Symmetry: C2
Amino acid sequence: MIAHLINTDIGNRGVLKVYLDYRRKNFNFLHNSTKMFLDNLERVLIVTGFPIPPMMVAETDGPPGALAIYRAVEMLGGKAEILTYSEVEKALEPFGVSLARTPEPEDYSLIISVETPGRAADGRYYSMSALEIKRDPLDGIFLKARALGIPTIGVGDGGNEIGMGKIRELVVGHVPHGEKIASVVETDELIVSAVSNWGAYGLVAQASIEVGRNLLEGWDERRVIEAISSAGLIDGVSKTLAPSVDGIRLMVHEGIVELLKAVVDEAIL
Amino acid sequence: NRGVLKVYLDYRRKNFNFLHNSTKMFLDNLERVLIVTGFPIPPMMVAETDGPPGALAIYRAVEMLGGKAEILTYSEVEKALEPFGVSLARTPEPEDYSLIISVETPGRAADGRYYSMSALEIKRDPLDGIFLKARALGIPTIGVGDGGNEIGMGKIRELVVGHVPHGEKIASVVETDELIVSAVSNWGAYGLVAQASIEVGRNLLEGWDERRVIEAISSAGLIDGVSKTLAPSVDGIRLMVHEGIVELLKAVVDEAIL
Ligand SMILES: [Mn+2]
Ligand SMILES: [Mn+2]
Ligand SMILES: [Mn+2]
Ligand SMILES: [Mn+2]
Ligand SMILES: [Mn+2]
């Protein structure tokens, strides 16, 4: 099953414990996020981009997930655009992605965050290692969306990203520096995953099953990771230009993807 | 299904390190390991494809690590595993082994009988008797199940009743020192080998060919637990998913070991 797979145990105790508790009360969270996804495809805004102190450069986790969702929205008949930092706009350039300009929540039917910084309790922005983030914020549009009642979906794997506000108690208690770094920003639905890109892929995968088409077909993890890495995006852990995500090498990410595609094909047949 | 996942969720929340702890025990008693497997599917009472593959995977890992292994199982399964030249247990006594493992084997319920997950009574010579003796003797024991009616589940009987249909009647009362719960039993066994690989620094799963093992045992007469037919699948799920599971585990091990 998809929610369980994208939360595969990868040696990160914090995220696993959060997932366990989160799913105890919200067993169908991925299903609900999907239902909200499918119902508002008209015009989707995807937000991604996570600055890595002390360089404050964006990492490899997030954009791939955004591209996958972007891809799925277009294939489903909707329209999508991406709000993110410049280094990320450059990395996604080859993929012919509609970039968002002067966006206001009103203009969208659904807004999704894939690994984006969420302001903490003190109104500041922190990394998982408690270092403060200094880069113009992107969560602002989610607050306006919540106030307007516009559908929102968050995807995260740490506790300091947009959407984590819906389960801050789980973050404070299961993650180091939690109380200080846990984002306060909420979304209508939330997807927790071992790696954010997988959360994004899981959404795409669950949607694939409900529409009867494998929306992941054609996706090439290695090609995408290597492109955005050659383009300047760093690995979150090594903080270097290695073609990897969250310090984990490509065969693992590639394996997740390929397994999701199989799980989807098997479910549609 | 929804049951197993809910039972896994609770168990993992309660025992965060159950797989790691199972692996420690495994790695510590490899001198002579007895692996038990074989689950009859009512009404035909023939063994299914879930279990034998996992048992075979452990058997192999035990030998690659220098220990010795033997298999206690039903006749059709012995036949099904004949091509792999696995040592078959004869008149097995508890005392003779340093470790006893079960991969998808029926455990007696509270009323002393055996039931499938659909509450049908299993009628065939039992294999759990040695686990009862093993724990009374103090012999290390590990169980791998994915339903709640398998050997080792007696350890979490409460979790089984609160999430599995027919629970009270079918939940196995048979305990085991360490217990592995997984969506499919075979994957529990591979997880064990993957975890052992990480602890040892060697990919013990390298070379594992899910396709061959399942088509082989299927050709030999082992039916699919869900469809109850001779399809090359396990738990009603086609091979491309199991190949994917295995491939994913092989990469995770590489990630840790390199
Ligand atoms: Mn994160
Ligand atoms: Mn990440
Ligand atoms: Mn690494
Ligand atoms: Mn079972
Ligand atoms: Mn099974």
